[PDB]
């Protein structure tokens, strides 16, 4: 628990510093994709309307 | 993300329905006009057989993340399937230690009967010689 | 049209109550606990080995998956345009 | 890039040859066994008819706080919460839509009868001015 | 029965239905919205028929009345 | 079983909680069986040094008996 979790916290905080930035980067992209998928349907719906 | 024919980032991806692989429309179109075939598997393919990449339909998706329920379930497989191999490292190493312990305790049990006889014989030789 | 899964899922949503998970590992207490200790050790080992793979593994992939999400996004907005162009044409036709 | 059933980002996408649409293998395999036809186009489709499309192991990195503990407890719990509360909310969205459609049609009819009633009214009033 | 690996297999099998249910529920959702949209548009379109018709009918009255 | 689903959450929690200790208990036993094996190897090699001095006391005795 001491040896491993100290390594884990070091591995985590080293990853977190590099990857919390890349998480934020990823999250935004995901959100954008989701939004787009939402506009896609309204345009398909309106296409089939018109 | 890539086109398999050129190696560029395709600006109009169209997926074929004979060898499942994302090709760039302008590149694959010329490949079909050369000969009606799929470049990878060399199976027959026409331009109408090729299909552009699309939004699914009406169900909204979200990007592939650690939260997502299916990605979280495939994660717990990795956890257990790795821990199952961790058990083999200790089951296999236990079968060597107990096998060396079995031969060690047998050599101990075969030897200590000879220590008991020499402690008898060397003291019996001292009991015999000192009396004379 | 599903098995037992649908009964407990619809009941969980109707009642508005999520099923309780293992609220045990985090708290614990010093001075049964020989097992709880040995479970902690192994857990830590797994995390640390896993964490180490993840940083390096994570570092290698920390951005390789981000690139995939940009290829996925741009494809949706191309369809937004293709739909935009058809409908506009239709409207113009009607107007004329 | 997504699946056309669940709204996933598939790990093993497979395309059907009757209607060009990418589904995640597990979800399309389940539909064919339930009723052997394509979900979107309602065309005849079997498991052998499907064509797998290479994905080269879709990027899903394992979080920094990844252990057997959160993966068993916190992550797996959230996944069956998110499956449960979504499909229940999705079942709520179906019926609403149906009702809406019905009432829309109902309202629409009433206006048709007004127009038909006023089409006889107007032209005969204009005709009377001509006479 | 109370093991472990098949519990995850069972968790997959019940989710497999969850996805199949959400699909058929969404199809009817959007397919009904097309009827809703086409109706509301055509309703207010057919509504403008009346606005036109009413004012012409009205013009026929004062015309004939004053004549 | 028909089993309530919120309970199946706590089962999977308990089963991972159990397997974590069933993996832990099997590793500390491997370390102590190897540790107690190493204590036997010291006694094994320490005993065969003690036989060499006991053979000398027998060899010294066989010389004195001859005289």
Residue numbers in the entry:
A (entry chain L): 703 to 752
B (entry chain q): 3 to 134
C (entry chain K): 63 to 93, 105 to 169
D (entry chain r): 3 to 133
E (entry chain s): 68 to 134
F (entry chain t): 67 to 133
Q: How do the authors describe this structure?
A:
Pre-mRNA splicing, executed by the spliceosome, proceeds in two sequential steps: branching and exon ligation. In exon ligation, the newly exposed 3′-OH of the 5′-exon attacks the 5′-end phosphate of the 3′-exon, releasing the intron lariat and ligating the 5′-exon with the 3′-exon. In this manuscript, we report the atomic structures of the human P and ILS complexes at average resolutions of 3.0 and 2.9 Å, respectively. Comparative analysis of these three late-stage human spliceosomes reveals the molecular mechanisms of 3′-splice site (3′SS) recognition, exon release and spliceosome disassembly.
The ILS complex exists in two distinct conformations defined as ILS1 and ILS2. The ILS1 complex, in which Prp43 is yet to be recruited, may represent the conformational state right after Prp22 remolding. Compared to the human P complex, the overall organization of the human ILS1 complex remains largely unchanged, except that the ligated exon and at least nine protein components have been released. At least nine proteins have been dissociated in the P-to-ILS transition, presumably due to the action of Prp22. These proteins include four components of the EJC (eIF4AIII, MAGOH, MLN51, and Y14), the exon-stabilizing protein SRm300,27 the splicing factors Cwc22 and Slu7, PRKRIP1, and the ATPase/helicase Prp22. With the departure of Slu7, the ATPase/helicase Brr2 and the Jab1 domain of Prp8 are only flexibly attached to the periphery of the spliceosome and thus no longer defined by the EM density map. Following release of the ligated exon and its interacting proteins, CWF19L2 was recruited to occupy the vacated space in the active site, generating the ILS1 complex. During the P-to-ILS1 transition, Cwf19L2 is recruited into the space between Prp8 and the intron lariat. Cwf19L2 closely interacts with the intron lariat and four domains of Prp8 (N-domain, endonuclease, Linker, and RNaseH-like), which contribute to formation of the putative exon release tunnel. These interactions stabilize the conformation of Prp8 and the intron lariat in the ILS1 complex.
